[PDB]
Amino acid sequence: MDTTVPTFSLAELQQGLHQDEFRRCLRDKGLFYLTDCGLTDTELKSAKDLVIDFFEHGSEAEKRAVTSPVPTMRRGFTGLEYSMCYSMGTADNLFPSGDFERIWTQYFDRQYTASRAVAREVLRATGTEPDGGVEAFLDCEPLLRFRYFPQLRMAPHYDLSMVTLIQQTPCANGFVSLQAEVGGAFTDLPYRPDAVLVFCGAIATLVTGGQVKAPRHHVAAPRRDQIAGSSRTSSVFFLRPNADFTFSVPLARECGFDVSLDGETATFQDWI
């Protein structure tokens, strides 16, 4: 019956406020909105604008040169020809211009910085020090995925991340595509001004010894009668651990994560 998603200010958590509520949210829900974490709506709009500019005005040759040769390589564009996707990591990125690169590099850096800070709070709140220290655990291999929807329903999934940070722009018609399972119900997760949405992922669960929930979520597509005015974007930053991050295979099964492999321990690399 507790199906609401709370909001916290990162700065306030860093000051040691709302400790008990933040800890309970992590354990029972594993998601929350976050303000005051160094992200702006304005910076999201600028990053968005320049990619949409490219979608609409880039030539065929320019588009091919920054298109992912194979989608498995999670760098560059897909769907340039439902949605176009732009993906970035920490290296080996594809950029259509110097200004695009500056804008998107800076946007990636701020998202990565905010994800590290929230993850730092998740670790602190549960008394967790990862093997090799907090800092080396958070200096990792993130992935950013931006989707733009101009103009079969999948089952809810949890993320294979420490945390995932999600910014979106709303639909003009009010449709909310993002939902999570909270307290036994599906709960809408709309655009909120000056707040980012944070999911805890399975790595948060494992690294903390099972103190953090990794909630399942999904993205609905609009029905036929909600398609006018359904244009939207989402920006999803996955804070993924280093490939050699090590966890207990037993604890993972115990937590309800599908793990196919055997042994006492495995690495994130093994799993993904």
From Swiss-Prot:
Known catalytic reactions: penicillin N + 2-oxoglutarate + O2 = deacetoxycephalosporin C + succinate + CO2 + H2O
Keywords attached to this entry: Antibiotic biosynthesis, Iron, Oxidoreductase, Vitamin C
Pathway: Antibiotic biosynthesis; cephalosporin C biosynthesis
Domain Fe2OG dioxygenase: 139-241
Pfam families named among the record's database cross-references: 2OG-FeII_Oxy
Stretches of the chain forming a coiled coil according to its record: none
GO biological process, one term: antibiotic biosynthetic process
InterPro entries for the chain: IPNS-like_FE2OG_OXY, IPNS-like_sf, Iron_ascorbate_oxido_reductase, Isopenicillin-N_synth_CS, Oxoglu/Fe-dep_dioxygenase_dom
Required cofactor names: Fe cation; L-ascorbate
One function term, GO molecular function aspect: iron ion binding
Family the entry assigns: Belongs to the iron/ascorbate-dependent oxidoreductase family.
Record's function text: Catalyzes the step from penicillin N to deacetoxy-cephalosporin C.
Protein name as it appears in the record: Deacetoxycephalosporin C synthase
